[PDB]
């Protein structure tokens, strides 16, 4: 299903679907804001499950990795990398009730746990 899937919001912006409504999705965009969009206003984006990035200590990080957040708004949190880009990642932590556990951090604000 579409929950937790990566979508293209506009040519520059990606997000992750975090709530399903009858005509719309709530989408957590790559900037950390939640937007409401009609189901057809976003396109399904091909996940790159083999993405690699650098964390704050220059470790290679990958999808499925457990990281700690050491800077930025979510500093102190811990999460699982769900979608990974060179500069940011969408993470999940089940203890976070906000946005179904999803949140977004810069990769340089992460360290492999």
Q: Is 86 annotated as a binding residue?
A: yes
* Separation in Å, CA 110 to CA 62, 63, 102, 104, 107: 12, 13, 15, 11, 5
Q: Which pairing describes strands 78-84 and 66-69: parallel, antiparallel, or unpaired? A: antiparallel
| CA angle in degrees (0–180, nearest 5) for 37-14-70 | 120
Domain spans of the chain?
1-45, 46-113
Buried b (16+ CB within 10 A) or exposed e, 20-37: eeeeebbbbbbebeebeb
Other Cβ atoms closer than 10 A to 111? 15
How far apart are the C-alpha atoms of 80 and 96, rounded to whole Å?
12
To one decimal, the resolution in angstroms is 1.6
Beta bridge partner(s), residue 46? none
- Residues sharing a CB contact under 8 Å with residue 52, sequence separation 6 or more, in sequence order: 60, 61, 62, 84
Task: Identify whether the C-beta of residue 38 lies closer than 8 Å to the C-beta of residue 21.
Answer: no
Determine if residue 49 is labeled as part of a ligand binding site.
no
């Amino acid at each position: 299903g579409p929950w937790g899937e990566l979508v293209q919001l506009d040519p520059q912006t990606v997000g992750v679907i975090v709530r399903l409504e009858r005509e719309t999705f709530q989408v957590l965009n790559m900037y950390g804001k939640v937007v409401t969009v009609r189901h057809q206003a976003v396109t399904r984006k091909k996940d790159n499950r083999f993405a690699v990035a650098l964390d704050s200590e220059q470790n290679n990080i990958h999808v499925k990795d457990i990281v700690k957040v050491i800077d930025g708004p979510h500093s102190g949190r811990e999460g699982e990398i769900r979608h990974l880009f060179r500069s940011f990642a969408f993470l999940h932590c089940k203890k976070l009730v906000e946005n179904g556990g999803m949140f977004v951090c810069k990769t340089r604000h992460l360290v492999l746990a």
